[PDB]
Amino acid sequence: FVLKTPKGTRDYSPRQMAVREKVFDVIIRCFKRHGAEVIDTPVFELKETLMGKSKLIYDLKDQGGELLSLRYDLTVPFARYLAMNKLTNIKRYHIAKVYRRDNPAMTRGRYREFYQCEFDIAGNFDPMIPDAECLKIMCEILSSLQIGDFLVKVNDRRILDGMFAICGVSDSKFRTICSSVDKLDKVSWEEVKNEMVGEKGLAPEVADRIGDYVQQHGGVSLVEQLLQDPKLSQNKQALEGLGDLKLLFEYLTLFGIDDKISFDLSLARGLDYYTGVIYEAVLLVGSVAAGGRYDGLVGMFDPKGRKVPCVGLSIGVERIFSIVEQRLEALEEKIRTTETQVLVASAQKKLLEERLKLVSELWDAGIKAELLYKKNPKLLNQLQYCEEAGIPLVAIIGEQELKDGVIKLRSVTSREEVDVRREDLVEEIKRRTG
Amino acid sequence: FVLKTPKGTRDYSPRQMAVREKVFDVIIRCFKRHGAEVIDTPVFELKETLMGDSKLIYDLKDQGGELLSLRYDLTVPFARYLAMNKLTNIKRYHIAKVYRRDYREFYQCEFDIAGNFDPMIPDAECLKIMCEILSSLQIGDFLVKVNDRRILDQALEGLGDLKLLFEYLTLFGIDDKISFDLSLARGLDYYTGVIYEAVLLQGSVAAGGRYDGLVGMFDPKGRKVPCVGLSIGVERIFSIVEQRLEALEEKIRTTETQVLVASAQKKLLEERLKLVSELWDAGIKAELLYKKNPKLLNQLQYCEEAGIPLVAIIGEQELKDGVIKLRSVTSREEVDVRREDLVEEIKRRT
């Protein structure tokens, strides 16, 4: 019986907390920029609410009332929220931990407790306006996160099942064909099609016709060239898809997001989910944020069953955390876990009480101060503390300096002091910091 | 139907979120003012980590791996974190959900100082932080009653200790707003020195105290580490501040959007898109209604219902002049300004 955290969970040390807080600040400043409200659901949904998904869900003991299960997702508690509250229209974000009892990776990548960050627009609006604002938010966040260059892959589910019908897939086999052509973004088309024909039983006569399609990506001229596609310009589903994507491109150009977006027919994920557009943000390589339009979901909890057409995105914050805390281990620079603005110290031997008097004045004024919990602390150790915690300023109290009603304001990094009268001290600390 | 959020647990509408964020804002703005790091633990530990009244604990099924258990306290994960990392010194707060089956899922706000420190300094600071938080927390007075475990017991050292705390508090200007009362007993199974709680004058608002053995439990060497803590019953405070907020008539905003880019004319959606992107790329946080051709009245009513005080009206006459029309939803007066002046002209009126 050892001291540790359950297999796959993890303590967040104060440094990690600082990183995650600084990422969350960017993200939430954007969500608030677009006027999104915030909601919060319980950490466990009433067991039978989470039925219809993979049974990797933590179950709880009876031991009293009913049975329960911890949430493996954030969008299902959202659908429950809208059905329960009888809401026809909301723009929200939701940032909270999720729990999936998978085998925790040892490489790593995958945990059992981790953070999920979802943003959603729910309601029946005019066509592709909210779907486009989602991409806008995605690129504001990714750009403002300073994590290098990113690209946004977009597609439509209708263009999918439509093109897959046109090439020739069995609807009893179409699923794993999407689960396979999805892998093209990470392996070659040849290692896709050889694995495909090698494990699928469908004629390469068909897989080749798929290959002429899925191997294509480009800008608006691609949705327009595929509008000219005679074999495709005859499918209702697909025509709808390419249309929505066309108008979406127009709105994106208006938003200035024209360049960082590519129409990539290889993208094919979450079909138990997406009924319209599908996003995936990538770096320059790996996934960072994804999402799309999913209308038939939220209506799966209404008494009647009226459709709640929803679009949304989800930021992969658990990865961005690592990208940051490893851009920080790269530059070998420290991260400030605290906001402390000055440390109050004294080199003389019986000045602890006066130190307290000063610190309480600096707190009451508002500036974030601190002192060391020893009656007669030695000044060199006291300055080492500031050098470690990144504290920028030290306010030193001396007896003959007390006689003059002043304070020595030694900078920890410049090592240069200055006598400042007790009157001006507050505004002076306020001057040398933020 | 019968879609039920589990018993004892309720959701959080944006109206309630608006309250919890402000309360948490003065709280965190205070714990940051004293230079306190923050840590976060998993929501569940091992069941055996949460042993010795003790069966109000939430458990998990056998799974096929370990027996896990939802946390019923924040100082127990604190203790296993201190013992795990062999940390002999840390000042730390923590605001997260706890799960005690008796509400049932509720927020705990713990703040504890730990380390070998000269007599009664961290205790006095815990009191100063309690008074800062509660004072800036809008409510009335506090008269936080303090006491000692070692006097209820040897009982001399506690008299000396509380004797040493009072002058520190007088230096903090805190003396007058505390008290000395000995009927204060609960809780007492885990505390070891000072014990205290505040009470609101018009109850369980804030409580805590020094406890030193609670951490040395998990230490294999038994090397006990001292500690002095405080917890703020934020679930009461949420209700009291949202209760004062209804008796004060003022609406509680759930959004911060300062402009709604609008148009009364038709076919001007795309121009409104150019505008909302120019405003979003800038600092200001505008919004736009999701319809190609909305009517101005619907948008203005949306603004007077959401709290958005400014409306960016785009008209063709306005468009071709390089100028955008601006109507304050409150005063209904109009000012038409250059597109270049628009961003700073919104930052100015907000």
**Polymer length in residues for chain B:** 350
Nearest CA distance, B329 vs chain A (angstrom): 17
Chain A hits for B17, CB-CB cut-off 8 Å, are: 37-40
Chain A hits for B292, CB-CB cut-off 8 Å, are: 126, 129
Q: Concatenated DSSP letters for A342-404?
A: EEEE--SSS-HHHHHHHHHHHHHHT--EEE-S-SS--HHHHHHHHHHHT--EEEE--HHHHHT
Closest CA to A315 of A165, A149, A137, A196: A137
Q: Give CA–CA dist A183/A266, Å, rounded.
A: 8
B123 neighbors B175 (Cβ within 8 angstroms):
no
| Residue B238 dihedral angles phi and psi, to the nearest 5° | -50, -50
Q: Give CA–CA dist B4/B26, Å, rounded.
A: 33
**Phi/psi class of residue B173: alpha, beta or left (left: φ > 0; alpha: ψ in -120 to 50)?**
left
- 3-state SS of chain B? CCCCCCCCCCCECHHHHHHHHHHHHHHHHHHCCCCCEECECCCEEEHHHHCCCCCCECEECCCCCCCEEECCCCHHHHHHHHHHHCCCCEEEEEEEEEEECCCCEEEEEEEEEECCCCCCHHHHHHHHHHHHHHHHCCCCECCEEEEEHHHHCCHHHHHHHHHHHHHHHHHCCCHHHEEECCCCCCCCCCCCCEEEEECCECCCCEEEEECCCCCCCCCCCCCCCCCEEEEECHHHHHHHHHHHCCCCCCCCCCCCCCEEEECCCCCCHHHHHHHHHHHHHCCCCEEECCCCCCCHHHHHHHHHHHCCCEEEECCHHHHCCCEEEEEECCCCCEEEEEHHHHHHHHHHCC
Question: Who contacts A205 (Cβ-Cβ below 8 Å, separation ≥6)?
Answer: none
Nearest CA distance, B183 vs chain A (angstrom): 30
Closest CA to A426 of A356, A336, A351, A341: A341
Nearest CA distance, A372 vs chain B (angstrom): 9
Angle at B231 between CA B172 and CA B137, to 5 degrees: 60
Q: Give CA–CA dist B40/A97, Å, rounded.
A: 12
Quote the tokens at residue B87.
């940390």
Check CB contact under 8 Å for B285 and A66. no
Which one-letter DSSP state was computed for residue A36? Answer: -
Angle at B13 between CA A129 and CA A121, to 5 degrees: 10
Quote the tokens at residue A419.
């006598």
Half-sphere exposure of B192 (CA within 13 A, CB side): 14
Cβ-count burial of A69 within 10 angstroms (0-12 exposed, 13-18 middle, 19+ buried)? buried
Chain B contact present for A33, CB below 8 A: yes
Q: Give CA–CA dist A282/A287, Å, rounded.
A: 5
Nearest CA distance, A410 vs chain B (angstrom): 19
At A225 the three-state DSSP class reads helix
Tokens 């004797």 belong to: B163
Query: B46: how many CB neighbours lie within 10 A of its CB?
Result: 19
A128 neighbors A252 (Cβ within 8 angstroms):
no
**What domains are there in chain A, each with its CATH number?**
1-335 (no CATH), 336-434 (3.40.50.800)
B108 neighbors B98 (Cβ within 8 angstroms):
yes
Burial of B126-139, coded b for 16+ CB within 10 Å and e otherwise, reads bbbbbbbbbbebeb
Q: Give CA–CA dist A323/B183, Å, rounded.
A: 54
Nearest CA distance, A287 vs chain B (angstrom): 24
Q: How far is CA B176 from CA A216, B170, B180, B242, B248, in A?
A: 76, 8, 11, 28, 30
Query: A385: how many CB neighbours lie within 10 A of its CB?
Result: 17
Tokens 């053995």 belong to: B213
- Least CB–CB distance from B218: residue in A3, A10, A140: A3
Cβ-count burial of B143 within 10 angstroms (0-12 exposed, 13-18 middle, 19+ buried)? middle
| N-terminal to C-terminal alpha carbon distance within chain A | 48
Residue A226 carries which side chain, given as an amino acid letter? L
Residue A320 is inside which H or E element, if any?
helix A317-328
Nearest CA distance, B29 vs chain A (angstrom): 9
Query: A273: how many CB neighbours lie within 10 A of its CB?
Result: 15
Tokens 């039983």 belong to: A201
Chain B hits for A97, CB-CB cut-off 8 Å, are: 43
Residue A70 is inside which H or E element, if any?
strand A69-70
Q: Give CA–CA dist B20/B240, Å, rounded.
A: 11
Q: Which residue of A has its CA nearest to B282?
A: A33
| Residue B44 dihedral angles phi and psi, to the nearest 5° | -120, 140
Q: Concatenated DSSP letters for A235-282?
A: -HHHHHHHHHHHHHHHHHHHTT-STTEEEETT----TTT-SSEEEEEE
Q: Give CA–CA dist A287/A285, Å, rounded.
A: 7
Q: Concatenated DSSP letters for A154-167?
A: EEEHHHHHHHHHHH
A294 neighbors A275 (Cβ within 8 angstroms):
yes
Query: A357: how many CB neighbours lie within 10 A of its CB?
Result: 16
The long-range contacts involving B179-182, CB below 8 angstroms and separated by at least 24 positions, are: B179/B143, B179/B144, B179/B145, B179/B146, B180/B145, B180/B146, B180/B147, B181/B145, B181/B147, B182/B147, B182/B151, B182/B152
- Least CB–CB distance from B41: residue in A11, A59, A340: A11
Check CB contact under 8 Å for A373 and B117. yes
Closest CA to A398 of A333, A347, A342, A323: A347
What does R_g of chain B's alpha carbons equal in angstroms? 27
Nearest CA distance, B288 vs chain A (angstrom): 9
Check CB contact under 8 Å for B97 and A33. no
Q: How far is CA A372 from CA A344, A383, A394, A405, B211, in A?
A: 8, 11, 12, 22, 20
> Binding residue per annotation — A81?
no
Quote the tokens at residue A280.
């995936």
Chain B contact present for A109, CB below 8 A: no
Q: Give CA–CA dist A129/A138, Å, rounded.
A: 15
Check CB contact under 8 Å for A66 and B105. no
Cβ-count burial of B186 within 10 angstroms (0-12 exposed, 13-18 middle, 19+ buried)? exposed
Q: Give CA–CA dist B205/B236, Å, rounded.
A: 7
Residue A33 carries which side chain, given as an amino acid letter? R
| Residue B260 dihedral angles phi and psi, to the nearest 5° | -110, 115
Quote the tokens at residue B294.
């909305």
Query: B331: how many CB neighbours lie within 10 A of its CB?
Result: 8
Q: Give CA–CA dist B211/B231, Å, rounded.
A: 13
Query: B339: how many CB neighbours lie within 10 A of its CB?
Result: 15
Residue A20 carries which side chain, given as an amino acid letter? R
Closest CA to A159 of A227, A216, A218, A241: A241
Q: Which residue of B has its CA nearest to A340?
A: B35
B34 neighbors A370 (Cβ within 8 angstroms):
yes
Query: B88: how many CB neighbours lie within 10 A of its CB?
Result: 13
B193 neighbors B147 (Cβ within 8 angstroms):
no
Closest CA to A197 of A208, A182, A212: A208
Q: How far is CA B221 from CA B71, B115, B224, B228, in A?
A: 25, 17, 9, 21
Torsion sign across C-alpha atoms B181, B182, B187, B192: positive
Quote the tokens at residue A433.
């910091």
> Binding residue per annotation — A273?
yes
Tokens 């961003």 belong to: B343
Check CB contact under 8 Å for A338 and B292. no
Label the pairing between strands B286-288 and B310-313: unpaired
Chain A contact present for B252, CB below 8 A: no
Q: Which residue of A has its CA nearest to B218?
A: A3
- Least CB–CB distance from B7: residue in A17, A36, A65: A65
Chain A contact present for B65, CB below 8 A: yes
Closest CA to B19 of B253, B310, B323: B253
Check CB contact under 8 Å for A42 and B257. no
Chain B hits for A311, CB-CB cut-off 8 Å, are: none
Chain A contact present for B7, CB below 8 A: yes
Residue A345 carries which side chain, given as an amino acid letter? A
Partnered with residue B91 across adjacent β-strands are: B113
Chain A contact present for B93, CB below 8 A: no
Question: Who contacts A239 (Cβ-Cβ below 8 Å, separation ≥6)?
Answer: A232, A233
Closest CA to B35 of B122, B161, B144, B141: B122
Q: How far is CA A169 from CA A160, A163, B278, in A?
A: 11, 9, 45
At A58 the three-state DSSP class reads coil
Helices (H), A104-235: 129-144, 157-167, 174-181, 189-200, 204-214, 220-227
> Binding residue per annotation — B62?
no
Check CB contact under 8 Å for A39 and B11. yes
Q: Give CA–CA dist A319/B41, Å, rounded.
A: 19
Please report the residues numbered 283 through 322 in chain A whose beta carbons come closer than 8 angstroms to any beta carbon of chain B: 301, 303
Check CB contact under 8 Å for B290 and A370. no
Q: How far is CA B283 from CA B313, B338, B344, in A?
A: 19, 17, 9
Q: Give CA–CA dist A375/A349, Å, rounded.
A: 8
Q: Give CA–CA dist A28/A50, Å, rounded.
A: 28
Label the pairing between strands B310-313 and B259-262: parallel
B214 neighbors B191 (Cβ within 8 angstroms):
no
Task: Give me the sheet containing A406-411, strands edge to edge.
Answer: A369-371, A342-345, A393-396, A406-411, A419-421
> Binding residue per annotation — B190?
yes
Label the pairing between strands B37-38 and B90-99: parallel
Partnered with residue A90 across adjacent β-strands are: A122
Furthest-apart CA atoms within chain B: distance in Å: 87
Angle at B257 between CA B252 and CA B261, to 5 degrees: 135
Chain A contact present for B44, CB below 8 A: yes
Furthest-apart CA atoms within chain A: distance in Å: 95
Which one-letter DSSP state was computed for residue A185? Answer: G
Query: Is omega for the bond preceding A108 within 30 degrees of 0, making it cis?
Result: yes
Tokens 């069953």 belong to: A305
Check CB contact under 8 Å for B290 and A129. yes
Q: Give CA–CA dist B92/B112, Å, rounded.
A: 6
Chain A hits for B40, CB-CB cut-off 8 Å, are: 11-12, 17
A20 neighbors B38 (Cβ within 8 angstroms):
no
B79 neighbors B217 (Cβ within 8 angstroms):
yes
Chain B contact present for A149, CB below 8 A: no
